[PDB]
């Protein structure tokens, strides 16, 4: 970046010490911290729980947030919409020295950055792994409630889980059982919004 060949400049750069080494060390520390943050945020469960034997959740409908097994990427509908909403440039992530000198008339600044030593590194965890982690978390929180977080996952009907979560906020559980058909519908409508 500073010299760009021109061996005289490289020789004259030696009298300035190890500034470049310090810069590289700081950048490497930041790069390591990014992956550490990602792993801390997402990698919290040891078991990759698979989807249960399929749709018996007391009338609740979780098809929107559950992963789609048909698409090549195991994302959900909401996750797909979120990925589509955020825009990113250079959706190949790789540019070798066979398309950087080509018919591009200096319209892309990716080559302008790359020709000056600026490089972008890939994250350790690809989105296809974050999707699996999220699917495992959803399966755990749907099938076993909060038990899987504190240890081994224990199965429990979803209606009873709703009843105990209602009890947790100071409301008697019976109120759920007398109004379940309402609540589920409301939930569906809510997610539909």
């Amino acid at each position: 970046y500073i010299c760009g060949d021109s061996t005289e400049c490289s020789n004259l750069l030696l009298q300035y010490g190890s500034f470049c080494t310090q810069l590289n060390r700081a950048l490497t520390g930041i790069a390591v911290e990014q992956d550490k943050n990602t792993q801390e945020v997402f990698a919290q469960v040891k078991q990759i729980y698979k989807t249960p034997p399929i749709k018996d959740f007391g009338g609740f409908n979780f098809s929107q947030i559950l992963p789609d097994p048909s698409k090549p990427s195991k994302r959900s509908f909401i996750e797909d919409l979120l990925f589509n909403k955020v825009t990113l440039a250079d959706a190949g992530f790789i540019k070798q020295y066979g398309d950087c000198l080509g018919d591009i008339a200096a319209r892309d600044l990716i080559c302008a950055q790359k020709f000056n030593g600026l490089t972008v590194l890939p994250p350790l965890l690809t989105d296809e792994m974050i999707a699996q982690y999220t699917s495992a978390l959803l399966a755990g929180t749907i099938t076993s409630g909060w038990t899987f977080g504190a240890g081994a996952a224990l199965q429990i009907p979803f209606a009873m889980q709703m009843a105990y979560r209602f009890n947790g906020i100071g409301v008697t559980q019976n109120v759920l059982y007398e109004n379940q058909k309402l609540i589920a519908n409301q939930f569906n409508s809510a997610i539909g919004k």
């Binding site: 209606a159 008697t172 019976n174 059982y177 007398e178």
Partner: protein, 116 residues
């Protein structure tokens, strides 16, 4: 402030599992916490129901779950297997049981009957 001097209900804030106690220790330019946690183990399957009809009204458990060992129904607490006889003292009543879904026929015992 939160874990050593009291008990915290926050999940995974101080160790994995339910939190009981913590002990602090010094270290060069740092502190070390030893957290004591309670972890369930040796789980078993059981058949459960939301409530029970005895006189035509729905009986809900005051605390715990309704389980069955195969032929008889009992009420037990959450994190430990402590079966007990279904009783009017550990259950309450709310409305008819035509609305509750999945309710199971059974008999509710009353300790007041033997004395009379």
């Amino acid at each position: 402030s939160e874990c050593v001097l009291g008990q915290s209900k926050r999940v995974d804030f101080c160790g994995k599992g339910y939190h009981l106690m913590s002990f602090p220790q010094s270290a060069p330019h740092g502190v070390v916490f030893l957290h004591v946690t309670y972890v369930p183990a040796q789980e078993k399957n059981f058949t459960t129901a939301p409530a029970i009809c005895h006189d035509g009204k729905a009986h809900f458990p005051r605390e715990g779950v309704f389980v069955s060992n195969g032929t008889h129904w009992f009420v037990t607490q959450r994190n430990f297997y402590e079966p007990q006889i279904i009783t009017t003292d550990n259950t309450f009543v709310s409305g008819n049981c035509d609305v509750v879904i999945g309710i199971v026929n059974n008999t509710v015992y009353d300790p007041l009957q033997p004395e009379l």
